[PDB]
Amino acid sequence: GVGDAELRERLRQCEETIEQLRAENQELKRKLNILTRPSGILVNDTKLDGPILQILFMNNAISKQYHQEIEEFVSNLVKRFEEQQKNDVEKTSFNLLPQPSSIVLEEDKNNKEAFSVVGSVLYFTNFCLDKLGQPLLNENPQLSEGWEIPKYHQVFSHIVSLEGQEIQVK
Amino acid sequence: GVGDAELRERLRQCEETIEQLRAENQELKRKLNILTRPSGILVNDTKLDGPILQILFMNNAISKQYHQEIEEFVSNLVKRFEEQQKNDVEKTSFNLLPQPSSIVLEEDKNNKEAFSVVGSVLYFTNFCLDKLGQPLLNENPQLSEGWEIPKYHQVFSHIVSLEGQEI
Amino acid sequence: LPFLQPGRLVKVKNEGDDFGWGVVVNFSKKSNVKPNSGELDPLYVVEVLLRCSKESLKNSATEAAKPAKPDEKGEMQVVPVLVHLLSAISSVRLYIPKDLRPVDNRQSVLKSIQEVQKRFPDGIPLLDPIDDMGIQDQGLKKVIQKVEAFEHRMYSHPLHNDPNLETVYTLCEKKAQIAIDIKSAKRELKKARTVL
């Protein structure tokens, strides 16, 4: 009796908990509309098919009158990559993903090597808001395709380590 | 007894399902933060002090070897913007907002003019997967930022209609 | 109106024929000059690039109609259409040439609409009325509920799974049209000499 009533109350509470969770798993995909991944596409390649990049044009930005130079620029990149296809050399030039957050799929083939956000930044007048970084090859920034190191003098022979951990760098 | 045990098993199964939904929600949290809203940002130059774009780089050799000219391009775009003055060319038409989907406000009052993203397009090198359209004033789509109309000849002189109201 | 950029791949059917898929070129709120029987609502004209027939272009003054037939290769031209004829809005924006007005670039546009159809064999994703536009008007929820209900029981029907459904559909359409014809003929015959 009392135990049965307690069990029924617990079951009702659990169902309500799921409702809250059911409600969130319904109101999230609403804001997630921006990401589309529309339907079944047929990507017979992974180095020339698939998207390039997703731009979120910002409001209250007087810099939106440039809506054409961006498009023509991102269109001339593919034709320049075609005219600069390669100086044919055998190299894998493979890359992995630091952050696996792929765009959602509301489509009721490939979905891993494509439709995967690799980097997202939020440009400012001078700032940036990177949180995912460029993917690396063998943890060495000296041969990657995107990174580019500035020039500097570097006369600071021998680091200051912590407590008794002097390391003879050179 | 047996009925009580079955009820307990059903309750446990329901709890396990609840846990899975909670884990899925915690996962989808990641996706609902790439929008980003660090905190309340101090801005003064309303509509001139704030983000300009938000590029989401995608897995493709073009978007991970040609990266640096994209950054120099956004840079040269932000610099070339400040060499016009003594003009009213910013909106010039009272360009009210289209119907946006505002980025979630992360808390970690004021600023009702907030980000309110106003578009998104996917490039596949032979088309464009647009959404959210593009802002423009009440009418007259030739006095707004954007909308570069091509040149056509308009050889026809009789508009199609359902019945009547012919040109 | 904010969804009418050049390349939107609209569809047009003014109850007579299918033109196909075509890219939008321009649009305007041009009102009725010299309004016949007055004017109280504004109309909009969309200048959109369809695929017309050779016979339609050779005169190009009678009705601006009769798109090309599957037995002819046809030629594409920009045609003005009414706003209330757009039976489908897509979510794809083919790139448009610069300054145009020849033949070859329109042929490339034809080629482009031809590969893009070779990428969504299921069907081009057009739009979602609930979210993409941003409608917050009371009542549309009722109609979407009703459409979801009707299609739910539709597929929930066994006949749907059964084959030869199309043949029976055509038969029923034919007999319904015969019934309509007989109704109209009896309506006319009910006035052969009736208080004329």
Residue numbers in the entry:
A (entry chain C): 43 to 150, 160 to 221
B (entry chain A): 43 to 150, 160 to 218
C (entry chain B): 651 to 846
Extract from the study:
The nuclear exosome targeting (NEXT) complex plays a central role in directing non-functional transcripts to exosome-mediated degradation, but the structural and molecular mechanisms remain enigmatic. In terms of architecture, we found that the biological unit of NEXT consists of two copies of each MTR4 and RBM7, assembling symmetrically around a highly intertwined ZCCHC8 homodimer, with an arrangement conducive for targeting different RNA substrates.
The cryo-EM analysis of the NEXTS complex resulted in a reconstruction with a global resolution of 4.5 Å. This density was separately fitted with the atomic models of the MTR4 DExH-box domain and arch domain, as the latter has different conformations in the available crystal structures (Lingaraju et al., 2019a; Wang et al., 2019; Puno and Lima, 2018). The KOW domains of the two MTR4 helicases sandwich a globular density that is, in turn, connected to an elongated protrusion. The ZCCHC8 dimerization module interacts in a symmetric manner with two MTR4 protomers via their arch domains, in turn positioning the DExH-box helicase domains in opposing orientations with respect to each other. The cryo-EM analysis of NEXTS allowed visualization of the interaction between the ZCCHC8 N-terminal dimerization module and the MTR4 KOW domain but failed to reveal other features of the complex (e.g., the RBM7 binding site), most likely due to their inherent flexibility.
